Design a protein around this ligand. Structure first.
Ligand SMILES: [Cu+]
Ligand SMILES: [Cu+]
Ligand SMILES: [Cu+]
Ligand SMILES: [Cu+]
Ligand SMILES: [Cu+]
Ligand SMILES: [Cu+]
Ligand SMILES: [Cu+]
Ligand SMILES: [Cu+]
Ligand SMILES: [Cu+]
Ligand SMILES: [Cu+]
Ligand SMILES: [Cu+]
Ligand SMILES: [Cu+]
Ligand SMILES: [Cu+]
Ligand SMILES: [Cu+]
Ligand SMILES: [Cu+]
Ligand SMILES: [Cu+]
Ligand SMILES: [Cu+]
Ligand SMILES: [Cu+]
Ligand SMILES: [Cu+]
Ligand SMILES: [Cu+]
Ligand SMILES: [Cu+]
Ligand SMILES: [Cu+]
Ligand SMILES: [Cu+]
Ligand SMILES: [Cu+]
Ligand SMILES: [Cu+]
Ligand SMILES: [Cu+]
Ligand SMILES: [Cu+]
Ligand SMILES: [Cu+]
Ligand SMILES: [Cu+]
Ligand SMILES: [Cu+]
Ligand SMILES: [Cu+]
Ligand SMILES: [Cu+]
Ligand SMILES: [Cu+]
Ligand SMILES: [Cu+]
Ligand SMILES: [Cu+]
Ligand SMILES: [Cu+]
Ligand SMILES: [Cu+]
Ligand SMILES: [Cu+]
Ligand SMILES: [Cu+]
Ligand SMILES: [Cu+]
Ligand SMILES: [Cu+]
Ligand SMILES: [Cu+]
Ligand SMILES: [Cu+]
Ligand SMILES: [Cu+]
Ligand SMILES: [Cu+]
Ligand SMILES: [Cu+]
Ligand SMILES: [Cu+]
Ligand SMILES: [Cu+]
Ligand SMILES: [Cu+]
Ligand SMILES: [Cu+]
Ligand SMILES: [Cu+]
Ligand SMILES: [Cu+]
Ligand SMILES: [Cu+]
Ligand SMILES: [Cu+]
Ligand SMILES: [Cu+]
Ligand SMILES: [Cu+]
Ligand SMILES: [Cu+]
Ligand SMILES: [Cu+]
Ligand SMILES: [Cu+]
Ligand SMILES: [Cu+]
Ligand SMILES: [Cu+]
Ligand SMILES: [Cu+]
Ligand SMILES: [Cu+]
Ligand SMILES: [Cu+]
Ligand SMILES: [Cu+]
Ligand SMILES: [Cu+]
Ligand SMILES: [Cu+]
Ligand SMILES: [Cu+]
Ligand SMILES: [Zn+2]
Ligand SMILES: [Zn+2]
Lengths: 108, 108, 107, 107
């Protein structure tokens, strides 16, 4: 319930990063920033992180498993953000969240 | 509670239309389909319709007001979808939902 | 994307059932209807089903896995709804969704 | 901008407070904490705050109006949390968010 508020805070920060970037910077730049695979990864990751926050906040039985999946979502989205100019901060945030997701998924 | 299940069904259908089209057809086509104003309208409308469904399902005090706003979101999004090839079904759905939103917002 | 529109429709129906029942019938009845384990199962299942719908609608890479988990959520919530006579429709809906979740997760 | 990231941060904090309290402390205590009007206000307010954050993050045209409504949700939920033991922090947070909502709705 300390590593927990940590994972919640991290997943909400990452939700903000990925959803906020997609719908502002990426949408406004166009080009590679809105190519299906990259953009879908961003929206997918943002929803996973927001859904993970929710499941943790209600102390769901499946919170630990959901965060395990959120770690994969975060990792996949980091890879898709590495190639792009301006997306290196997002990719770092996603890798940071992925670590947090993995830590709390392995505690009880 | 009949006009109610109607508004819920309509807003969920419209959520599916706008969010599903944005993230599949629009994202895959590119061009006009991902221009910021049009795309933002689609994502905005989808979330409004999904949020309206939620507030109705929990019999929120603000459900009637939220649907009033959802009607405007739906109308605005219909206008943004009129110009675009393959978006005519979406635009019709948005106008249909806007009507449903307006009916239930004016009853008890 | 036929078994897919099926899973979407089912998960949205089940979201409606579990969230709508929790916040209306269960909240209004009280008693066993708002006991933590039962109620948390309901809210948890509702969010899983709505999250699953979303991930499927955007053709997320992880949609198959998420639905696998949604099947377990639905099954667990069905068990928690069995003991109350007024929750029999909810429990059936959850078992129906769990089947749909399992079909599409294996495609 | 600045007052914007402020409203987002505040609405997400308030979402955390109201949803996390409802589903933990309130659900676990029962009694007044799960009476329909109070509990519905908490869930409603949490969703309003989370929905407002979303609409702001995507720079929706309707973000200003939505936050206006979130301010009312926050105020109403604060009133419903004032009476209850252990809900004093929640009520303060709701009043704080309501102010933030009102600032950005007017800028
Ligand atoms: Cu997390
Ligand atoms: Cu977590
Ligand atoms: Cu995350
Ligand atoms: Cu992120
Ligand atoms: Cu970008
Ligand atoms: Cu991007
Ligand atoms: Cu994420
Ligand atoms: Cu992400
Ligand atoms: Cu996460
Ligand atoms: Cu994640
Ligand atoms: Cu990414
Ligand atoms: Cu990402
Ligand atoms: Cu990222
Ligand atoms: Cu990213
Ligand atoms: Cu992330
Ligand atoms: Cu994470
Ligand atoms: Cu996580
Ligand atoms: Cu509606
Ligand atoms: Cu409505
Ligand atoms: Cu709608
Ligand atoms: Cu729509
Ligand atoms: Cu389109
Ligand atoms: Cu579009
Ligand atoms: Cu729409
Ligand atoms: Cu809409
Ligand atoms: Cu609507
Ligand atoms: Cu609408
Ligand atoms: Cu639309
Ligand atoms: Cu539209
Ligand atoms: Cu539409
Ligand atoms: Cu549209
Ligand atoms: Cu709509
Ligand atoms: Cu509507
Ligand atoms: Cu509506
Ligand atoms: Cu499903
Ligand atoms: Cu389901
Ligand atoms: Cu359900
Ligand atoms: Cu019940
Ligand atoms: Cu119940
Ligand atoms: Cu469910
Ligand atoms: Cu369920
Ligand atoms: Cu499901
Ligand atoms: Cu599915
Ligand atoms: Cu499920
Ligand atoms: Cu279900
Ligand atoms: Cu259940
Ligand atoms: Cu259920
Ligand atoms: Cu059920
Ligand atoms: Cu149930
Ligand atoms: Cu299902
Ligand atoms: Cu599913
Ligand atoms: Cu705010
Ligand atoms: Cu705001
Ligand atoms: Cu708020
Ligand atoms: Cu709150
Ligand atoms: Cu409480
Ligand atoms: Cu409470
Ligand atoms: Cu609140
Ligand atoms: Cu709130
Ligand atoms: Cu708010
Ligand atoms: Cu608020
Ligand atoms: Cu509140
Ligand atoms: Cu409150
Ligand atoms: Cu509060
Ligand atoms: Cu509260
Ligand atoms: Cu609030
Ligand atoms: Cu606020
Ligand atoms: Cu606000
Ligand atoms: Zn999983
Ligand atoms: Zn309004």
């Amino acid at each position: 319930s300390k590593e927990m508020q940590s994972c919640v805070d991290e997943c909400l920060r990452c939700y903000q990063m990925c959803f906020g970037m997609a719908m502002t910077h990426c949408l406004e730049t166009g080009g590679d920033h809105v190519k299906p695979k990259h953009f879908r990864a961003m929206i997918s990751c943002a929803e996973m992180c927001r859904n993970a926050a929710h499941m943790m906040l209600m102390k769901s039985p499946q919170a630990r498993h959901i965060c395990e999946d959120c770690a994969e979502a975060c990792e996949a989205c980091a890879k898709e953000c590495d190639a792009l100019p301006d997306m290196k901060d997002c990719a770092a945030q996603c890798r940071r969240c992925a670590e947090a997701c993995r830590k709390m998924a392995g505690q009880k």
